[PDB]
Design a protein around this ligand. Sequence first.
Ligand SMILES: [Zn+2]
Ligand SMILES: [Zn+2]
Lengths: 82, 252
Amino acid sequence: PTDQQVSLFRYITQAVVTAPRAKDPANPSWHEKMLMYDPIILEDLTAWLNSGQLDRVGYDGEVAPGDVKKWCESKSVCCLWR
Amino acid sequence: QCKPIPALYTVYVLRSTVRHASLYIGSTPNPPRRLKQHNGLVPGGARSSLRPWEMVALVSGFPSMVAALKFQWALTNPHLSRSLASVVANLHLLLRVPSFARWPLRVHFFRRDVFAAWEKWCAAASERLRPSLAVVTDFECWGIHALPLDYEPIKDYVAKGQEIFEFERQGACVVCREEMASGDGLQALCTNQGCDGVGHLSCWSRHFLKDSILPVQGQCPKCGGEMEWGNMMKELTLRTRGQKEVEKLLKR
Ligand SMILES: [Zn+2]
Ligand SMILES: [Zn+2]
């Protein structure tokens, strides 16, 4: 919606969907968790996004949880605060 | 999440029969019991003056309780996003809002008056509602007492996976074609009976979406049938997490 988020959203999408799929079905990846309609704790996802997963897909800097929540809602991903 | 996709979770519009103008918006996985509580027959409800209440309509298929509550609050508060006219119109917009547009939802109406307002509003609607969003009616067991509260409507589907994955008949993925080992990642099974096509979970999503993260509708590569992403996940999560829930279903 905002002119600056639209760039950040393309990266957040990338980092989530390019992360390696899980080899253990009990501990799925973040992309797989959204696929199965899991409620997504924003603190956990935002922290994972700042672990180095955004530097991998070419976004230097840091993301705020509110920006991540707006990402989830644009993709119909169920999310919630902790 | 640690529990499988609930067998049923609804967001309902409750109306008084004493006063047709009094509406109430809650949620429950068991509409008959919650209606019994709203009418004092079962302990647990929130004012007899307006009893007995009725469920004129409800939205079903919320893949998690969290999701159903995110929706319930969003409809009790349209000023941050009263009457049957506004409830019907707010419901129509929320179903197009991106935060809920791709959820495995079904809209149920139970009163010809309330369903009439829905059609009156859809006739003037700005955007058309997504055709995958089933809007069904059920007037005058009927109504809410027809909705299946358990996992029975997918009993055979669940039994199919219990065979394919217990005996390692999973075969090779039907998208990437690479041979999948047993318990090697999340492997999602097709829904249509007679077919045993299995694939890696992220491969189906890649396939259904040919921009987006969450699939909605799609066709099977092996058998050519059509599936809704909600059902395929309701079985995957049932198999991954709900081992106890599966046993009670098949009497095992
Ligand atoms: Zn695959
Ligand atoms: Zn098939």
